[PDB]
Amino acid sequence: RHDREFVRTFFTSPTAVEGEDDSAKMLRRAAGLRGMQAPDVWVPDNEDATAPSMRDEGAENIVEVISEQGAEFPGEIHPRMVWHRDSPETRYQGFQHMLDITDPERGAVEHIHGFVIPEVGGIDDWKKADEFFTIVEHEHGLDEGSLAMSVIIESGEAELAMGDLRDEMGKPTNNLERLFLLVDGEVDYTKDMRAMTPTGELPAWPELRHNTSRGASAAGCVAVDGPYDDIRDVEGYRERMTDNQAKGMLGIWSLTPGQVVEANTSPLPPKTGSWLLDAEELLGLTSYVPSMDDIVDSMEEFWDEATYQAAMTPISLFQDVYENRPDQHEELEERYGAGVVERAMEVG
Amino acid sequence: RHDREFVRTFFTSPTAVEGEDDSAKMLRRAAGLRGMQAPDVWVPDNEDATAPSMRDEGAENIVEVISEQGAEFPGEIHPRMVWHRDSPETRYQGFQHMLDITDPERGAVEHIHGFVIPEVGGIDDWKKADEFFTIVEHEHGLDEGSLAMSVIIESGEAELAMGDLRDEMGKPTNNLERLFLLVDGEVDYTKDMRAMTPTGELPAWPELRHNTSRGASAAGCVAVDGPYDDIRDVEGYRERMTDNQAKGMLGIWSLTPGQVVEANTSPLPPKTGSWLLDAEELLGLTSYVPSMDDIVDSMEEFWDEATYQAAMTPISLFQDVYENRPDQHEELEERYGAGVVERAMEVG
Amino acid sequence: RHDREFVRTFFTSPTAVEGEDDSAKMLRRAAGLRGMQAPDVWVPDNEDATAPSMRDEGAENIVEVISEQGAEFPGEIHPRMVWHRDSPETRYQGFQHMLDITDPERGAVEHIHGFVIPEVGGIDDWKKADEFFTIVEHEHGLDEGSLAMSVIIESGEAELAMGDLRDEMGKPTNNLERLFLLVDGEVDYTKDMRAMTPTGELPAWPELRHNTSRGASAAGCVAVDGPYDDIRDVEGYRERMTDNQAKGMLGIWSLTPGQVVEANTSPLPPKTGSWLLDAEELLGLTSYVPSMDDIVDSMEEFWDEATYQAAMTPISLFQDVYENRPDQHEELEERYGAGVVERAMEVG
Ligand SMILES: [Cl-]
Ligand SMILES: [Cl-]
Ligand SMILES: [Cl-]
Ligand SMILES: [Cl-]
Ligand SMILES: [Cl-]
Ligand SMILES: [Cl-]
Ligand SMILES: [Cl-]
Ligand SMILES: [Cl-]
Ligand SMILES: [Cl-]
Ligand SMILES: [Cl-]
Ligand SMILES: [Cl-]
Ligand SMILES: [Cl-]
Ligand SMILES: [Cl-]
Ligand SMILES: [K+]
Ligand SMILES: [K+]
Ligand SMILES: [K+]
Ligand SMILES: [K+]
Ligand SMILES: [K+]
Ligand SMILES: [K+]
Ligand SMILES: [K+]
Ligand SMILES: [K+]
Ligand SMILES: [K+]
Ligand SMILES: [Mg+2]
Ligand SMILES: [Mg+2]
Ligand SMILES: [Mg+2]
């Protein structure tokens, strides 16, 4: 239902960076990318890529930068707004930023293809977002359905919501036809699922990626994988894409122009080859399993709000266990030290 | 709800082969198989195993061969008809061939156990097929529900449709009790999911096989895996079955009498052994990752319509990218050569 | 919705053991556990851990032992009752034992946190169990919703039922808010899915564990993995938990105090370490793939009813094949011996 049949690169940029300067710096550069360095989809990101006290400013910079520079940008532009299935405030915030940004007088709207909506819940949460797109279009004389909606799949409820999308989208009481991308968000998803790994590196969640690909094919949307944080790990990123491509998930998130170029290239067939036959640089060979002490520190002396929350599970578990198991209060001191116990018990 | 509690082998044969001769040759031989060489289920295949201009002839040969030879055939016989969730013509075609084939005057119907229906969509597409079985039974005085229906699961929508089968089958407005097999079709499925792999060998789709096994156990049907093309790769076929058997998927597709014998044997417990302890023939050791040039050729100078379509994705992707990214038009020539670019741009 | 935000250990004990003695021996000891040796959740198990002719006695011992010793027990107590989606008798049995056990005069109810219900089917089966909790609470003046309900997910239908739990629980016609744990039961599940493996060791069912974790996060329950039988295999148990923890499944079944301690410890962050870098005791290194002869014997000369049933598949398959394929009757004798064929044909 959309111009892009396939999207390989989904690239995010903070919208207002705090360090003095031009807070719209990241956006102006990124709006300058061309060729293999430019994403098929570009996401001025007013959500997690951007500190909350910066978000009203980020919304302004989005209009300023796309006003000034959007006509030229060779891919499609879809800013991520804030949203949360569990928070009416965040939802209203996301909507008011969508309404400013699309004010036709400001010159941004005509280079904007749609918005990306994070944290959606079950299908009745998607209908709330859909309802805000509809109202925004009507307030500004945009054609109905002209703003594409894309969602980040980053909770269990959203993963389930993809299963009856075909028949929900057909109901005449929503304009859910506007759906474009179903984008995995492995970071917040790890958190919502309360998963933990010893390195604190993300699980691979193959089933989420299968489900997101399936949902996309049944519903006529386009499936895209989420952020791959270890940016230096070029070969890892390529393994993950090759892996995603085997599931029919052909696009991935990109965090840097390097990742844009790798991701833009990977699903394209090779130049030449190839025959296969059966039988300081140390950092990409090491990993570190933190102790409780270290995990405490990596928030206590204190990576966005997704990386933060998503690392708090072994500690919320420890907390739960200590609150409810007085009989284990001794062995837990025996094991961490009276110091650390009483210390980990404050983080929540 | 069916005579076969378990089906190990699901074996297909073209119904009308073009090379002069007796076009029903493949069927007559296959109807001759006995013992470990005979499938539990045999599928005269009027769909993808058979060129479209041969299909009306294939339908006749089905009646001629099962008329002449069906009484003897020691397994169950279930011809695959044509069908497609997105094509009313194909659906009507499949139904008219079902109506001819089952004409009681022709002597085939009484050795026919049911039909296999490819390309089904969501549950309301299965109800269309179910409705055609019902009408065919009534037109020919067959008992209601006597023709078993089996579906190939080879789209995302069909994979989802298995989830509420129990309650849809109970509705008195369909005869969906007739469902017998839920058969994965990894070939067309790879396509519908737009998956690609570097060798162009099929992904393994473990989750589809899990879902198909689950759907079968919740709904009282029998789960069967799809075609395993690399026929010479005897050990691969056995690994895949052992793998399927761990998911509760106990039957697989068979493409040859060799595969029928391997598949007939594999789920049976071994003769003897065994103790396991912890720590030109080159073709089954090589594979070839084609270049864009080669992929172009393998359709441009030009494996059924499933293998064709299912290999067109890296090219439809390339096409999409070239149509929509003029800024990359240079680097794509830099990379494939002006020759190949302009050449790949015609295939659709 | 429950006091325990996280449950690491789900430990079962037979309720009435046949060997002369005090039939409540296992319960009295287990009610004595403290510290790292005590499970977060303890399951006096009146279902498969206990022979059927012992179950009315087991129900009495539950009241006797929790009466006498429950006040002290430092975790939560949730006895498993009998139940089966396909058996009205078993369901009524489970309910009558729940009604005795919770009689306020007997002194057990006030140390009981809820019950665990095995073998549930689709959501309308969960509503039957939910209805029995409601009636039991009313018969004994317990607050509504005070008995937590937990289900063992050990059929395909139950795995599917988790998908619309959020909206079913909200219906005012059930008290399904009481749901607490969604606990995989890989044993009976292997059976219901008709899976088989060469060693007869359980498949890993990663997708079930993904689905159960997802269902739990969408519905506000707590996901727990099922029994890990090879008790001596300490390192295996730790691999499985580390694996489960990557899916957000943070609790597992425990069969022994050893497993309680390993499981209680594993999700807690380590004491120290650790840096990782890229590149008679023979029993935990061997496994045995039984022949048909051996499989026949391991029921014919004859591990609970779950392990029994769950091992009967290669034989029910053999039986089906022999009943329906007379043309293979020779080759099956050629292969097993006339002796074994005619022998395996009696087990059902
Ligand atoms: Cl809310
Ligand atoms: Cl939903
Ligand atoms: Cl992982
Ligand atoms: Cl699913
Ligand atoms: Cl897609
Ligand atoms: Cl249609
Ligand atoms: Cl459907
Ligand atoms: Cl694969
Ligand atoms: Cl099955
Ligand atoms: Cl029943
Ligand atoms: Cl259900
Ligand atoms: Cl396995
Ligand atoms: Cl959980
Ligand atoms: K609509
Ligand atoms: K509408
Ligand atoms: K897809
Ligand atoms: K029906
Ligand atoms: K009917
Ligand atoms: K099954
Ligand atoms: K309720
Ligand atoms: K209620
Ligand atoms: K979870
Ligand atoms: Mg996120
Ligand atoms: Mg097919
Ligand atoms: Mg069980």
Author numbering:
A (entry chain A), B (entry chain A), C (entry chain A): 5 to 283, 331 to 353, 387 to 432
Please quote the paper that reports this structure.
Malate synthase, one of the two enzymes unique to the glyoxylate cycle, is found in all three domains of life, and is crucial to the utilization of two-carbon compounds for net biosynthetic pathways such as gluconeogenesis. The structures reported here for the glyoxylate and the pyruvate/acetyl-CoA complexes of Haloferax volcanii malate synthase represent the first examples of an H isoform member. The overall structure of hvMSH reveals that, like MSA and MSG, this halophilic isoform is based on a TIM barrel and indicates that deletion in hvMSH of an N-terminal domain distinguishes this isoform from those of MSA and MSG; and that the surface of the barrel normally buried by this domain and connecting loops is instead involved in trimeric and hexameric interfaces, suggesting a potential evolutionary coupling of the N-terminal deletion and oligomerization. Despite the sequence divergence and overall smaller size of hvMSH compared to MSA and MSG, the active site and catalytic mechanism are conserved in all three isoforms.
